[PDB]
From Swiss-Prot:
Source species of the chain: Schizosaccharomyces pombe (strain 972 / ATCC 24843) (Fission yeast)
Protein name: Brix domain-containing protein C4F8.04
Full-length numbering of the shown residues: 63 to 123 of 306
Signal peptide range in chain numbering: none
Amino acid sequence: ETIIEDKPDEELQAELKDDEFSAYFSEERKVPKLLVTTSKRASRKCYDFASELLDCFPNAE
RNA sequence: GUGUUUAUAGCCUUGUUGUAAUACGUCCACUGGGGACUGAGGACUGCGGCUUCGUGCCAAGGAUGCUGACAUAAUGGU
């Protein structure tokens, strides 16, 4: 029963309008700034994939 | 060209001028550099040399000291 129906729900929208992600979906339009890091003492194999993940997301550090 | 005997060169031989020098052989428990490989052992003993003596010092029963570079690298293996 947790499946969201295609018909818009006012309870679901009331929850989201002041949610943790509300600053992104509101008229404020908070530009997302990403911080990608790894685990401690990672190898170059992790960096070759992290660089690709860095290409996917602009404005990511 | 023929024969000469220091001539306006000198050569050799001989004793001989103050002695030598040099080369070769040999020796120094005399000495100054360059290069390479090794560092086994692992408290102390020992034999020695310095030292007035030294919990002294030393090249004396086997390497120590001073540095520099790297973790996303350096180094080696398959």
